[PDB]
Structure 1
Amino acid sequence: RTLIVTTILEEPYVMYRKSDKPLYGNDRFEGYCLDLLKELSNILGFLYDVKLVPDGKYGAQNDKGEWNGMVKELIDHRADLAVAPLTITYVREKVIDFSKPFMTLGISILYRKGTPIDSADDLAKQTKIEYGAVRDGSTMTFFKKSKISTYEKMWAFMSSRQQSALVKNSDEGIQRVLTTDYALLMESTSIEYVTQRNCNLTQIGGLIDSKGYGVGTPIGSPYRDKITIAILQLQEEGKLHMMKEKWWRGNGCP
């Protein structure tokens, strides 16, 4: 039987394909994660239906501690796999079973080119430049939970004024960096994609932490360890590197 795969639109992982006619089914989509799912299905021999997560969220807890997003789909057995840039975090790994990482990344800073700002510390010790993150994503959660001095300071700033420095999604954050005096705390793999495409933006500093994206499965899933092995195969054969180059390469920026 066919596996149900929950996912979410996010460039260049999952995108609607361009066509002159309405699209249906898996043919609606392309991107890094679709290529990954193709290669996993060729190794393991499953068929799959891709289904966008109905609430359009990744996965976080409400005040009752109930989950939402892709994470909740897995928990409730409404999906067999989640294939998306879903960050492997302590809070999520308690409730679902992630494969080992297919991509390795960290939080970093997206900002304008040409400025004296060089680090998170540089941001934290001032108030003129605004800075934030996507609300309720793993980056925000990192700042909220940190007991490291600099990151707390930054959290105090981000959460101030009813979280006015936060944004609902990455595209809103990018447009805010492009238009106003604002820096976005963003996952490094997304910064790499953005800066290959808008030449006035750059990454500031290095990575603030280290983590991965993994395929999500419900706790107890027999597919988890099989997908880990298939990922390690694809990594060792250079295929994951090829897939990243295909989807990230931009040809217009210095």
Structure 2
Amino acid sequence: THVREKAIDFSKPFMTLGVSILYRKPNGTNPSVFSFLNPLSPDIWMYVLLAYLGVSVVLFVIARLSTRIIGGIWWFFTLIIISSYTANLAAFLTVERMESPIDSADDLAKQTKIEYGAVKDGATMTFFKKSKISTFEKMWAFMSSKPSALVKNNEEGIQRTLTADYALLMESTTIEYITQRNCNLTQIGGLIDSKGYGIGTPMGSPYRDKITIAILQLQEEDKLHIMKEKWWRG
């Protein structure tokens, strides 16, 4: 950063790493017929077949117009019943499907009812202070008002993510690390920012320029990507 550029010298980035979102997979499936009897109460689940038996019992009792009007009234109100519950079941499914997918980070700044918070004292909080996007400076105003979701540690945000609806907000490299090592926690969305990380040298280091040339050779030859595999995928 330019304050760190003025402070100390900097070679070309050894990695350009952003910040990204982390939340756990909720991991839901849909269980059988038990999830298929859902709009109606078990009383009516008895009442349906206890009404359905009666038509057959009076048709067998007749063996001892008639059937015309009877059968017309039965079909006539069977249609009413199935129209009511196909309306209720289709509108049940459609009010189900309209909720998803409102998980936006633009949707975070408006309200307090989702947790989403930085690793406090990281560069994440620095970036939220430095944020000039209205949504993320409103999230910054959210975090300033009351912390609500602010964690300080990596494991603290992991445990807040496992114990709440907590978007853990931290650097993308530690999220890659953890999601290689923990499949429940996953990176939600993509990067929040793209910013470069450099090697600190004294102010007035020609060592830094050698280090710059060596970084050019290294990332030309991808020797660091071996190190990327061995430290991020383990």
Which bin holds the TM-score, normalised by the shorter protein?
A: 0.5 to 0.7
Q: Does 1:99 align with 2:83?
A: no
Q: Which has the higher strand share?
A: 1
CA positional deviation for 1:228: 1.2
CA positional deviation for 1:227: 0.8
Q: Does 1:194 align with 2:178?
A: yes
**Could you tell me which amino acid in structure 1 is paired with residue 228 of structure 2?**
K
Match of 1:209 among 193, 196, 207: 193
CA positional deviation for 1:208: 1.8
Match of 1:218 among 197, 202, 223: 202
Residue 178 and residue 114 in structure 1: after superposition, are their counterparts in 2 closer, same or farther (change >3 A)?
closer
CA positional deviation for 1:150: 0.8
1:126 equivalent in structure 2: 111
1:150 equivalent in structure 2: 135
2:120 equivalent in structure 1: 135
Residue 109 of structure 1 aligns to a residue whose secondary structure is strand
Larger relative contact order, structure 1 or 2 (CA cutoff 8 Å, min sep 6): 2
Q: Percent identity?
A: 88
CA positional deviation for 1:239: 0.8
CA positional deviation for 1:179: 2.2
What TM-score results when the alignment is normalised by the length of structure 2? 0.63
1:160 equivalent in structure 2: 145
2:226 equivalent in structure 1: 242
CA positional deviation for 1:232: 1.3
Residue 131 of structure 1 aligns to a residue whose secondary structure is strand
CA positional deviation for 1:164: 4.8
Structure 1 gap segments, 5+ residues each? 1-88
What TM-score results when the alignment is normalised by the length of structure 1? 0.59
1:22-55 deviation digits (Å, cap 9, x = unpaired): xxxxxxxxxxxxxxxxxxxxxxxxxxxxxxxxxx
Q: Contact 2:115–2:148 (CA<8 Å) still a contact in 1?
A: no
Inter-partner Cα distance in structure 1 for 2:26 and 2:148: 26
Inter-partner Cα distance in structure 1 for 2:176 and 2:167: 15
1:46 equivalent in structure 2: none
Equivalences, count: 161
CA RMSD of aligned residues (A): 1.9
Q: Which has the higher helix share?
A: 2
**Could you tell me which amino acid in structure 2 is paired with residue 241 of structure 1?**
H
CA positional deviation for 1:109: 0.6
Ranges of 4+ aligned residues in structure 1 off by more than 3 Å: 114-119
1:165-203 deviation digits (Å, cap 9, x = unpaired): 322222322222122221121111111111111111111
Q: Contact 1:159–1:165 (CA<8 Å) still a contact in 2?
A: no
Match runs of 1:7-86 below 5 Å: none
1:189-232 deviation digits (Å, cap 9, x = unpaired): 11111111111111111112211221101111121111111111
Name which of structure 1's ranges 137-146 and 172-181 shifts more when overlaid on structure 2: 172-181
